[PDB]
Design a protein around this ligand. Sequence first.
Ligand code: CLA
Ligand code: CLA
Ligand code: CLA
Ligand code: CLA
Ligand code: CLA
Ligand SMILES: CC1=C(/C=C/C(C)=C/C=C/C(C)=C/C=C/C=C(C)/C=C/C=C(C)/C=C/C2=C(C)CCCC2(C)C)C(C)(C)CCC1
Ligand SMILES: CC1=C(/C=C/C(C)=C/C=C/C(C)=C/C=C/C=C(C)/C=C/C=C(C)/C=C/C2=C(C)CCCC2(C)C)C(C)(C)CCC1
Ligand SMILES: CC1=C(/C=C/C(C)=C/C=C/C(C)=C/C=C/C=C(C)/C=C/C=C(C)/C=C/C2=C(C)CCCC2(C)C)C(C)(C)CCC1
Ligand SMILES: CC1=C(/C=C/C(C)=C/C=C/C(C)=C/C=C/C=C(C)/C=C/C=C(C)/C=C/C2=C(C)CCCC2(C)C)C(C)(C)CCC1
Ligand SMILES: CC1=C(/C=C/C(C)=C\C=C\C(C)=C\C=C\C=C(C)\C=C\C=C(C)\C=C\C2=C(C)CCCC2(C)C)C(C)(C)CCC1
Ligand SMILES: CCCCCCCCCCCCC/C=C/[C@H](O)[C@H](N)CO
Ligand code: OEX
Ligand SMILES: [Cl-]
Ligand SMILES: [Cl-]
Ligand SMILES: [Fe+2]
Ligand code: NA
Lengths: 36, 348, 37, 31, 76, 38, 336, 30, 449
Amino acid sequence: IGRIPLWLVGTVVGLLAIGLLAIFFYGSYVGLGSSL
Amino acid sequence: IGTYQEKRTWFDDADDWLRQDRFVFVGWSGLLLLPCAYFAVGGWLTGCTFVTSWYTHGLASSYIEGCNFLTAAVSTPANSLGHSLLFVWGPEAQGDLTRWFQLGGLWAFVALHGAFGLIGFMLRQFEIARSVNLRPYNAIAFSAPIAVFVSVFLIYPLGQSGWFFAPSFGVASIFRFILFFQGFHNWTLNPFHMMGVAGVLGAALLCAIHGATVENTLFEDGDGANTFRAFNPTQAEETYSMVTANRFWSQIFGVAFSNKRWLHFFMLFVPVTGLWMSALGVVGLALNLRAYDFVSQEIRAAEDPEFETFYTKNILLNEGIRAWMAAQDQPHEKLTLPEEVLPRGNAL
Amino acid sequence: KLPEAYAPFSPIVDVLPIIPVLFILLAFVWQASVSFR
Amino acid sequence: IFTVRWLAIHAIAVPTIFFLGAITAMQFIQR
Amino acid sequence: ERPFSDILTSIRYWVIHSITVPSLFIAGWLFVSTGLAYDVFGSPRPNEYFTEDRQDAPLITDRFNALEQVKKLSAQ
Amino acid sequence: MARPNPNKQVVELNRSSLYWGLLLIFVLAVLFSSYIFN
Amino acid sequence: ENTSLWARFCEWITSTENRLYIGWFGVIMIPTLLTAISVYIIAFIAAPPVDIDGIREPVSGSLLYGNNIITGAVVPTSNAIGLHFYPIWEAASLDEWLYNGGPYQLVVCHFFLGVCCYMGREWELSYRLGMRPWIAVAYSAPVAAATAVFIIYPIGQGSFSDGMPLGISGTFNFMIVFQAEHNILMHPFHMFGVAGVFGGSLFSAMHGSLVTSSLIRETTENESANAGYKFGQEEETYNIVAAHGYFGRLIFQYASFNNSRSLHFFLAVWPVVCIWLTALGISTMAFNLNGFNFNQSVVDSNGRVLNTWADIINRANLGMEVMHERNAHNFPLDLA
Amino acid sequence: MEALVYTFLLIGTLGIIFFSIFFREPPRIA
Amino acid sequence: GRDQETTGFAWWAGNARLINLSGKLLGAHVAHAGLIVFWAGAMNLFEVSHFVPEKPMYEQGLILLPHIATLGYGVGPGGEVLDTFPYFVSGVLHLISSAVLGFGGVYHSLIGPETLEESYPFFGYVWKDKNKMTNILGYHLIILGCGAWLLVLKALYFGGVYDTWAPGGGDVRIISNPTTNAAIIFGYIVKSPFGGDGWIVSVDNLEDIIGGHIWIGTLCILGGIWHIYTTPWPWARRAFVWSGEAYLSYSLAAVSLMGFTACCFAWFNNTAYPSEFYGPTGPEASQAQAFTFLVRDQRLGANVASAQGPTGLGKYLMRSPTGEIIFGGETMRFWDFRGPWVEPLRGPSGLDLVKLKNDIQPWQERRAAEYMTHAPLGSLNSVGGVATEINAVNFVSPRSWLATSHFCLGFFFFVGHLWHAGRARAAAAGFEKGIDRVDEPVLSMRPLD
Ligand code: CLA
Ligand code: CLA
Ligand code: CLA
Ligand code: CLA
Ligand code: CLA
Ligand SMILES: CC1=C(/C=C/C(C)=C/C=C/C(C)=C/C=C/C=C(C)/C=C/C=C(C)/C=C/C2=C(C)CCCC2(C)C)C(C)(C)CCC1
Ligand SMILES: CC1=C(/C=C/C(C)=C/C=C/C(C)=C/C=C/C=C(C)/C=C/C=C(C)/C=C/C2=C(C)CCCC2(C)C)C(C)(C)CCC1
Ligand SMILES: CC1=C(/C=C/C(C)=C/C=C/C(C)=C/C=C/C=C(C)/C=C/C=C(C)/C=C/C2=C(C)CCCC2(C)C)C(C)(C)CCC1
Ligand SMILES: CC1=C(/C=C/C(C)=C/C=C/C(C)=C/C=C/C=C(C)/C=C/C=C(C)/C=C/C2=C(C)CCCC2(C)C)C(C)(C)CCC1
Ligand SMILES: CC1=C(/C=C/C(C)=C\C=C\C(C)=C\C=C\C=C(C)\C=C\C=C(C)\C=C\C2=C(C)CCCC2(C)C)C(C)(C)CCC1
Ligand SMILES: CCCCCCCCCCCCC/C=C/[C@H](O)[C@H](N)CO
Ligand code: OEX
Ligand SMILES: [Cl-]
Ligand SMILES: [Cl-]
Ligand SMILES: [Fe+2]
Ligand code: NA
């Protein structure tokens, strides 16, 4: 019951969301759908 | 009910189980809304990720191909299929989900389930407004998005040669559909479309200006520079000065609102009338009833080279759109137009 | 490119512009830490 | 538990994470 | 009640979901890496768009024979 | 009910609604006249 | 004691007791807007043909020259002029001035001044009324968009001929040419603008239908519902709590607007910030930043190019390209 | 013949605008 | 810091809480200065990390290296790079100075004194103290004058600056005899912003640049001494609002005009933004297209004065609306362009016909070819050309990036000036919170509005 801080959890999930979006923007320059 | 005995039944038990406060209100309409809406949204997210468009249009519209958000789509099926319902059990697919996906049945799935999800949502608006005992103006307002959806994704493809000419569900596919309506239909010149444009831009004006006027004519209730903490849930006085707002807009614009109820009814009325007019115009376009031409100006421009207007420039641009987009957008016509006959200006 | 002595430090230089964006996001993390006090 | 909130949040989270793994997988697919 | 403040901040929730969230992520990864997406969803692989028979966009051009025609036109 | 009609109602149109009606009809004219003349 | 002529004029200009507030912003607005209105009406009715493209192909534009309401337009300034500031006293004759698109430049300069001073006058009336001042900030969005289509796009493109024609069909022409060159549909700022006006209609119908859903009974079925509201009344006319509970159990109980203050703030901020972003979309495409370019993005293992929906957009874009300014081009690449 | 009609309709809309600005029902505080 | 109950400003306005907290305000400012110096150092080192010796600096998405090279560091005749060590030194000095400024900002933000009034009366100030407000303004004006004179010193004795107008493709030249004529200096200021005049963006020679900098440096130092030794006059006191948020609003309007001016400088000026380092301007690329299509068709044995277009105007050469000969085509709209590759071919009648036929130069011809092939046309993907072109070239001009970004920033800062001007006026008036509900002004005014 609240043994991990909610802001710490939110910061970590925001980090995973930002890393996921950075991966998605990275993969548009390589591989399929990359104009090369 | 109503000073009668009326012994309880399975209907009454189910109704009492459905109409109660939950995290999400389910209700009777949720028997339709929740599965149909989940299937429409999930089917769109499935088609934008895996389901191909290589066989229905000869394009690429999925993330597995390499398309991003702006470019992926759930594509309308081939013109050869016409207005087939594309049932997975139907004749075209014959029960087989895999080749059902690539034949375009997913568009029919998303369209039919989205229509029934929209019906379920409006029934949910009716039901919730009944349970809370409020007037159903939210459902009356939602009547206009369903009117647009049925006229655009159902009436227009039913009027044209088939589902192929419906909008495919996806950002770049919607843009194709929009430029298609420009080139083939001259949908900019249509009075019903420009009524829709006036309604939407006026509704945005009303939204922005009601928000700014309310947020700039507040009463104090202060002892704090954050105004957002000056609002309590249950009281009986106006939070912003109606008379000051009316005075301000009377001296700025010349006319101003003085009835809150008519102000909010106007905020309700403008987008609904705009979207209904756009729906009626798209229904006209379903039968190729275009406002493409002005007969007097066209005959004047044919009998005078010196007559040149922006409308005639638009007509030329529309010829350019049609002739440069037909070959790659309509594979069913087998239009192999040579580079020779395409319209073209000097240089470029 | 960078001078030869700083060639092994090129990958650490390649990240350096994003620090201000991390600074504004760090301001938001700090506000979440003080619970939007 | 197994509430309406549970089922309604799982229907929109479980395929979402599966799909996010799916797009992240194809995001590194070469040609 | 659990008003979404003690349930996402609970180690009981977090231990059980430290396996289901990334197990789902790995399952979604394998669904795309093993070609099962290509198989079940009808999308052709990046090296299988044009066969020896045709070198252009395929056309359905039929309705009740559409199933076997897209069978014969696709990459098996 | 009685010999006279019990549902006797008065209609109202304030000057504001007169202004909306006149703007609406004249705007329909300005919009649609180019198309009716064609 | 207040007997001097300037102070009497000052108290007349700054007076709230006027039917229309003038103020010191209105003393710049009113002549400029009246000049622009006069020239716009006169030009729309009786303007002779205007050589917009600079290639001696004058475009009629006016009603007396055979246009209707939809087709009539105050034609942009000549491409030969560019941005060279063409007023009446620069032209040898009114005939030359009307040929080279002078009324458009006059209307554009006066209208930009008029809208800037309109936003200032909105602030100044809010100041003299004891109001809070940010309605001008909200009006800065359509002002920014008008300046983006009347000033910034001509400046970035080198010619006032690039401005939006003051008309209906001219506006449509401006859009077709704009998408041809820049692909505005594939721009995030324009996507934000479309989301802004779609959400503006969304939230206008939403808030209007929630307020109309929660109206309080004072009237009968004989009387229109607005007759239950009295101007200047202190009590609130609708049940905010009932509407809020409705919306919460409709979508999400926590994710509703419990403050009517914050709700109206959201209503103001959403289309204003989105119209700001799309006005900068036009402003950045003035300096050739354009929309996204996703042509030949997907290729197969053997290098063949798959057509895509973006490639269908590209095909329509080419059709919009080559036909626009069909005679004005002499060279392949359209850098000018 | 058409420019006559268009001009009349435009000045009619402007006249209704003028009458609506300067000849509205005066709102009352009560 | 504080919470909302002790300040009344929420977290989304938390900086407002330190309006009256002079020490924390100073720390936030110097920490921000550390951020600016940090981005300059980080981006500069990143740019020299991503620098290729062959390709010019406009092909590689560089926006700081062209600034340093315009100053005349590491470049020679024509604009080729001789060394990147000056750029590396600039980046490193910026990074380390940012570390020092960030230490200071963190110090005053976390443990610095709350207010500087009770102990350091030189630094502590109240916002309504017009004397000390002008004193701080004078200190910063002296600093600005010193910076302008640093540029003057760099142009006069510290290697000179890069001139694109010097013969042979331009080079780094030492400025001798700058134009100190007041008429030439202020005729730019009084000039119209429109075509043919361009306001101050049409400064087209380094002598005018450095003379204007001499004038701005001397006037800035003079204004600094004047402000330190005077107090604002009663007419200024009546004309102005004297709160900190009002001073912020004034600064916002000023830097918004500065951002719009920088947008136009990047898009149009080619002497302060040499085309070798920043790429061609829009007018430059259009005139380059017409120029190289003139010379190609000359070398293919054709006449240029003849061969009118489809419109009967002249495909290669026409006359501008004032009379002098200009390049044919839609590039006539860019007839106002002046570049170092057209002036040796341009005489009294505009483009000289015999000079344009005979006196072509190889470096001018190559420069025109490249200014065609690298036009400021591109997408957000950094795909070069018009929006209908292929995905084959990876190029968007630094002029395009600078002009677009700084127009966006200038616009939002004008809007921020509106927000702060309104709120500062309302806070001085007592309106920042709302209408008083019992002393409402409209209720004391007659009806009929
Ligand atoms: C340019 C960005 C910037 C800067 C310089 C500041 C600066 C400041 N803010 Mg602030 N803020 C910002 C953005 C910024 N803010 C944004 C975007 C928001 C919205 C989320 C806020 C919302 C906000 C609120 C609500 C409050 C402040 C407050 C403050 C002041 C004290 C903060 C404090 O000491 O608490 C303690 C902070 C910490 C203990 C964490 C900081 C740890 C370090 C400094 C982070 C950076 C580490 C750095 C890399 C180390 C460099 C060392 C060097 C040697 C290289 C301070 C001067 C407070 C105030 O007004 O004072 C009364 C206040 O309550 N801010
Ligand atoms: C403000 C001035 C400015 C300018 C003119 C440039 C210009 C440029 N940069 Mg640069 N940069 C800047 C600031 C600037 N940058 C800052 C502050 C940082 C620190 C984060 C960086 C870090 C950086 C890196 C690491 C790189 C560049 C690169 C580049 C080049 C390619 C740009 C590109 O394709 O990116 C893409 C264009 C965009 C992403 C558009 C930006 C989107 C806007 C700003 C935000 C969206 C607005 C939003 C919708 C509104 C909502 C408001 C709010 C709610 C958020 C280009 C010349 C690249 C390069 O060439 O290296 C040499 C490179 O990799 N920049
Ligand atoms: C996201 C934030 C951001 C970012 C990343 C940038 C980035 C940039 N801006 Mg900027 N700017 C911003 C926000 C931003 N801006 C905002 C919000 C505004 C207000 C609207 C402005 C207004 C602005 C203007 C007016 C200008 C820029 C300019 C620039 C560019 C060069 C900066 C420069 O050198 O200035 C200068 C640095 C200083 C003044 C600090 C002092 C430096 C000293 C005086 C220089 C000493 C040199 C000396 C001669 C060396 C010799 C040594 C000795 C031998 C004498 C740069 C890429 C310039 C530009 O390129 O125009 C496009 C420019 O003129 N910006
Ligand atoms: C960033 C620099 C800066 C700042 C913020 C200030 C700020 C201030 N100065 Mg100032 N000043 C400066 C630099 C600066 N000065 C410099 C460099 C000089 C040397 C020339 C002066 C010389 C000076 C004097 C002599 C006086 C001030 C005064 C003032 C105060 C009132 C000014 C006013 O009423 O508004 C603005 C003024 C006007 C609008 C009327 C001036 C008429 C025109 C606009 C002046 C420029 C003419 C030119 C054609 C304008 C077109 C240029 C434009 C297109 C870019 C004010 C606090 C007054 C004061 O209070 O003394 C203490 C005063 O007497 N200053
Ligand atoms: C150097 C200029 C400057 C300075 C010093 C200030 C200072 C201040 N402003 Mg302010 N403002 C400015 C410019 C400035 N503003 C601009 C340019 C705008 C845009 C119109 C605003 C709009 C604004 C509003 C609406 C408000 C303030 C407020 C405030 C006060 C509290 C700020 C705060 O902590 O909020 C907290 C900071 C955050 C929550 C972070 C904001 C995150 C943004 C949305 C992300 C944007 C990043 C993105 C990359 C931008 C791209 C756009 C473009 C470059 C493409 C403070 C004294 C508040 C106030 O009035 O208090 C008295 C307030 O209500 N400002
Ligand atoms: C086919 C079909 C079906 C159906 C199915 C379904 C219904 C499902 C699903 C599904 C789903 C349901 C899916 C999904 C997905 C999702 C996703 C993929 C997501 C996402 C998102 C993103 C990616 C983003 C994020 C973010 C970030 C991170 C940043 C900021 C914010 C945002 C949000 C933007 C069946 C079998 C029955 C049968 C018939 C047919
Ligand atoms: C590494 C390296 C190097 C080296 C370098 C060096 C050795 C340097 C440095 C550095 C430094 C050394 C930096 C700095 C910083 C500083 C600063 C940043 C400052 C400051 C100051 C201030 C800020 C002031 C303030 C004030 C006061 C306090 C008093 C009164 C007022 C005033 C405001 C004036 C080189 C490049 C060679 C090479 C490569 C590597
Ligand atoms: C207070 C506060 C805050 C903050 C602010 C700021 C803004 C800060 C800062 C700061 C800063 C501004 C920092 C900076 C820094 C720097 C550093 C730390 C450095 C360094 C150095 C090094 C070590 C380098 C090295 C190198 C070289 C020499 C070159 C080559 C390469 C390399 C990189 C290796 C916030 C917002 C969060 C919240 C509120 C409060
Ligand atoms: C470096 C250079 C140069 C030089 C420059 C200069 C020398 C500048 C300056 C300048 C100046 C010397 C400026 C001035 C200014 C000012 C302004 C811009 C202002 C203002 C303000 C206002 C707008 C006002 C307002 C008002 C009024 C009206 C009254 C009441 C009060 C008030 C405040 C409200 C040149 C270009 C040659 C070349 C390039 C480089
Ligand atoms: C918004 C928000 C949030 C959050 C999110 C996130 C996830 C954030 C983040 C963030 C981050 C992620 C941060 C970070 C940071 C960091 C920083 C800011 C830093 C720094 C520093 C510096 C300055 C550096 C330096 C250096 C150099 C220069 C070189 C080498 C060495 C060194 C590294 C030392 C949440 C959901 C909770 C809630 C809602 C709201
Ligand atoms: C910008 C023009 C000024 C040129 C010379 C600047 C140097 C410093 C000039 C300041 C002159 C001091 C004026 C003194 C005013 C007195 O303090 C007041 N009359 C009160 O005694
Ligand atoms: O005007 Mn209308 O379209 Ca914009 O690009 Mn250049 O200019 Mn003209 O050509 Mn392409
Ligand atoms: Cl055209
Ligand atoms: Cl051309
Ligand atoms: Fe309301
Ligand atoms: Na052409």
